[PDB]
A paper describes a structure:
The Pat1 protein is involved in different aspects of mRNA decapping activation. Hence, Pat1 is considered as a central platform protein for decapping. Indeed, the crystal structure of the S. cerevisiae Pat1C shows that this domain structurally belongs to the ARM repeat superfamily, which mostly encompasses proteins involved in protein-protein interaction. In conclusion, the crystal structure of the ScPat1 C-terminal domain has revealed two functionally important regions localized at opposite extremities of the domain.
We therefore cloned the ScPat1C (473-796) domain, over-expressed it in E. coli and purified it in milligram amounts to homogeneity. The SeMet labeled and unlabeled proteins crystallized in three different space groups. Only structures refined to higher resolution (crystal forms II and III) will be discussed in this manuscript. Three and two copies of the ScPat1C molecule are present in the asymmetric unit of crystal forms II and III, respectively. The crystal packing radically differs between crystal forms II and III. In crystal form III, the two Pat1 molecules of the asymmetric unit exhibit a very intricate head-to-tail organization with an interacting surface area of 1,635 Å2. As this value is in the range expected for interfaces within homodimers, this suggested that this ScPat1C domain could also exist as a homodimer in solution. To investigate this possibility, we have analysed the quaternary structure of ScPat1C in solution using both size exclusion chromatography coupled online to a triple detection array (MALLS) and small angle X-ray Scattering (SAXS). MALLS measurements on a protein at 2 mg/mL yielded a molecular mass of 39.3 kDa, indicating that ScPat1C is monomeric in solution (the theoretical molecular weight for the monomer is 38.6 kDa). Furthermore, the SAXS experimental curves measured at various ScPat1C concentrations (5.4 and 11.2 mg/mL, i.e. concentrations closer to those used in the crystallization experiments) clearly correspond to the curve calculated from the coordinates of the ScPat1C monomer but not from those of the crystal dimer. This SAXS analysis indicates that: first, the large contact area observed in crystal form III is created by the crystal-packing and does not reflect a biologically relevant oligomeric state; second, ScPat1C adopts in solution a structure similar to that observed in the crystals.
Numbering used by the authors: 474 to 644, 654 to 796
Write the structure that this text describes.
Amino acid sequence: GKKFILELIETVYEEILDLEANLRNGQQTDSTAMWEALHIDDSSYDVNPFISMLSFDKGIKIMPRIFNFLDKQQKLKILQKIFNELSHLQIIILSSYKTTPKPTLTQLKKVDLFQMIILKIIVSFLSNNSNFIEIMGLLLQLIRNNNVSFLTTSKIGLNLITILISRAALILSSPEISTWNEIYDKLFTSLESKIQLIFPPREYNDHIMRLQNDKFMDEAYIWQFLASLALSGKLNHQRIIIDEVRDEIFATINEAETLQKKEKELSVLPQRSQELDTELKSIIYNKEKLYQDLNLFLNVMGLVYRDGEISELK
């Protein structure tokens, strides 16, 4: 229960602080006490205690400090534990536009903190003497133990996937290359015909917009995901991707062009007030942003939107 997990987190901070005082005072560090404090090898509960800790702000806040006193095998086991349970985590449930269609500002902040800390940790683990087979194993754990599609309805799940595949791509035996093909295929099959769902619905965007007093959204992470999915696949995969997100391409082009006209009508006004000036700068920034993020994906496909057309590259 909640009071139990809170007591657990308290104990963990005490272990970390003792550990951190030792390292400062030059002397011995032994992470054995802190590791046990995590209850990572504890099957005695409904939800694993360490996992439940991750849905408290104070629990997630101590994760980097925990990783400072861990070896790679301990690091891997933790990430394995997490990847296993991803789509069940309370914070992921908060993160998905499906399970949480009307988040509060506070819930958005909790979500942002989680993905900020967790992603950085996962990234640093992959950037630090990590091999292909490690990454593959993590992707495969992700795919086989989760509703992959449900994960793609969260910024966190989407970002996690594109980090994993982009780290895969950025990297080797022939069986390893083949392993990547099998895994990509598994990932791809899990998403086939559900790709457009990565785009939250209009009701959700309107809600977020009203919430944050902002006329615009930021979906760079969505197009980034598509670009990396497309770059990691073969020509038939790319074909299937561009087909599933067809209407999103058109809608994006449509919005950009609507911005282009509003820009043209404000641009020719002399001595713009502060309000009109901030508005024009906003229009321009957002127009260019839609072009840029859309072209990140199209360029991968050998395509470009420029002067009212999707033309071939060069």
